[PDB]
Subunit: 84 residues, 3 copies
Amino acid sequence: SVKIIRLVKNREPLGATIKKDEQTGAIIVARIMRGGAADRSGLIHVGDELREVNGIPVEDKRPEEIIQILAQSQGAITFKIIPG
Amino acid sequence: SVKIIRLVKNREPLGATIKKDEQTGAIIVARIMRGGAADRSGLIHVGDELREVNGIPVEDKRPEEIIQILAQSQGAITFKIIPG
Amino acid sequence: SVKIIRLVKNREPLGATIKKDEQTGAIIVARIMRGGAADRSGLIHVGDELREVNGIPVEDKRPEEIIQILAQSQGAITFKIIPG
């Protein structure tokens, strides 16, 4: 079931890495850095699937693009996710 | 026609994503984040082609390398671009 | 011979890029940004091979993953390296 979550990163990384599952095509949260922005929010966890970032769907994009959107965004950031 | 532009990013992302066009080989600005460093400069736009970053030519490099140069650089950053 | 080094990056990039050597499989430091965190430490140099980041071995991971770990980490960061 798809959930909307929102957190803030300012002058700090998101603190999360992603990996595309090559069999399912899912973009999955692979790692949460301890004490980073993602971790402190308590809203996003290893195994969660990313569906959208700031209203941008992933489903038609390559990982290299999605990883840049996570890195190049600033301030409040919305994710639509399927929780693990 | 190739243009030299210079902007500053300090303790913030560039606020721009790039994508290689697999047919032409061009590295093209794919997205400008609203309110980010790139946007605020007014110097770089979706559809612009990157030719050089800080005097480093792109033309013999893979996207994974160029994306890291954009992320790992700090302070004033020069681009040589072909405007869209 | 493998060396453990530790540096700090906070609200700034690492200031280093990496590239996998497709023949050897090594993850090699390709560039050190002048005045960046990596450069100022004096501990890491072009040609050094990364073996681990914060205790995470590289040897079973893709470059896209390792590059994210470098970018998404904050604060003190440990590397295990083979100096060039």
